[PDB]
Amino acid sequence: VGLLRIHVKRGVNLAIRDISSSDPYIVVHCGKQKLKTRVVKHSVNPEWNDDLTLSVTDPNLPIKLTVYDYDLLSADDKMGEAEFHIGPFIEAIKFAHQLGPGLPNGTIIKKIEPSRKNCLSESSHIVLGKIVQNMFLRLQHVECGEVELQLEWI
Template sequence: MDSPSSGGGGGFGSSPKEAPKSSSLMDSLLGLLRIRVKRGVNLAVRDVRSSDPYVVIKMAKQKLKTRVIKKDVNPQWNEDLTLSISDPDLPIKLTVYDHDTFSKDDKMGDAEFYIKGFVEAMRMDLHGLPAGTVVTREQPSRQNCLAEESCITWTDGKISQDLCLRLRNVECGEVELSLHWIDLPGSKGL
């Protein structure tokens, strides 16, 4: 039987394998997630007969936004926003706003999604699979904001995922996104 003083290695906090505290962002960074904000579908009307929508995406302390599309409830943004990913378990929050010139911007709904399935697919060895192979499917549920089934696909040596998110806390609206991973030299990687 090992006692704490017999060198059996069972002591608390005294393990020589304790990881040093990292001060560098690159040590904890897994890579970058490029989110293509494609378009909004049937967004809520917040001005007279229309809205001036834009999208804000948040993850932890990061906050990114698209440009404003004037007078359009079916806007086409086709804009890339890039998040630094160090914890793939955190939710990514999306909020649509109506831009107002003389007052506070009106909220036009929100959604959130997780990239855990996307990251798990990234960790698989998929080389040699034919282009367009569906790696996994995510179904709409009460736990996510998916409006329809979302496929994680292997194409041209990369993983991608298209999402159609149903907005919450609003009478109508969906936002379509596409996810792509960017590996960084020197990052922890997947």
């Protein structure tokens, strides 16, 4: 158990779902938690700069992220989804805690490579007072779009 802070920074080249634009927001859901960002109107490169805080019980179940086009009068169209795992992040955190302040500032603790078994668009760095994981996610099931976020815990 712990508290995962997801800083949702921005979307890049998101899909159009309302002809001229989209009104994108993100839903994160982990088991049964569902948290949402604010809506950015008429944008496919939204700068959400929005923080979500997730309560982790089970560090091994994936965290799902979905982008939607907000529309007041109909169900919101999906604009891509991605999953990520926070196992490696939680382990990098345990380590840094057990080493103490002897671990130098700016140290990259772990590099995670994009593969066919994840949604990274580039190598994800776990970096050190705070351990942080920088993620650039390739959205699945959509013709374009990426989301950039940074993870914190706890």
